[PDB]
Amino acid sequence: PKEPEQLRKLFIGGLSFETTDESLRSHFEQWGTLTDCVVMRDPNTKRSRGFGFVTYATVEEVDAAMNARPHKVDGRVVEPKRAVSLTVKKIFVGGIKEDTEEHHLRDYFEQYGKIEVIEIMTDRGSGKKRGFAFVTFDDHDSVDKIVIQKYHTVNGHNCEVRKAL
Numbered sequence: 410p411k412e413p414e415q416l417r418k419l420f421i422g423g424l425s426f427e428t429t430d431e432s433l434r435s436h437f438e439q440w441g442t443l444t445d446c447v448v449m450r451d452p453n454t455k456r457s458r459g460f461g462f463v464t465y466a467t468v469e470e471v472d473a474a475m476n477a478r479p480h481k482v483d484g485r486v487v488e489p490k491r492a493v494s495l496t497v498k499k500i501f502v503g504g505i506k507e508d509t510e511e512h513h514l515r516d517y518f519e520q521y522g523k524i525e526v527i528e529i530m531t532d533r534g535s536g537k538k539r540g541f542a543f544v545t546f547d548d549h550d551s552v553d554k555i556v557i558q559k560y561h562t563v564n565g566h567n568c569e570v571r572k573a574l
């Protein structure tokens with residue numbers, strides 16, 4: 410059945426004040442079926458608040474829209490982000506124990522986004538692996554996709570993954 414609506418929504422910040430529900434829809438419909446599309450406006454002046462939301466029919470359509478950034482809507486580059494579950498590019502990965510290596514984390518996480526840093530944590534005194542790591546991506550959407558999954562399995566371990574600093 411249908412993925413939860415919260416996971417199919419994109420907040421679109423930085424809109425041109427001239428963007429309307431119709432022009433926002435016409436833009437974002439290029440990447441999927443939109444079940445909802447709203448420009449936030451002042452209740453008295455009707456002047457745009459400079460942000461809005463679009464809701465796609467599926468998560469894969471959200472991915473397609475995010476993969477097509479940068480989006481220029483009505484002449485202005487906007488800022489799409491998945492709805493809340495801050496905006497960061499780094500994750501903590503725990504529960505990897507002592508047998509998990511860089512390539513294990515790379516091979517798994519590279520399908521969420523472009524990796525810039527993998528840091529497998531070792532003990533300051535002994536050099537032994539401590540069983541957690543940090544992965545830094547080039548962009549926040551990778552992290553946003555990662556942290557909404559219920560499960561992450563890497564090197565046979567069920568991992569705890571959260572946003573880092």
Ligand SMILES: O=c1[nH]cc(NCCc2ccccc2)c(=O)[nH]1
Binds near residue numbers: 528543573574
């Ligand atoms: O490479 C990294 N190593 C460690 C990190 N943890 C943040 C340290 C901290 C967390 C909570 C309170 C105070 C300090 C990090 O973000 N990146």
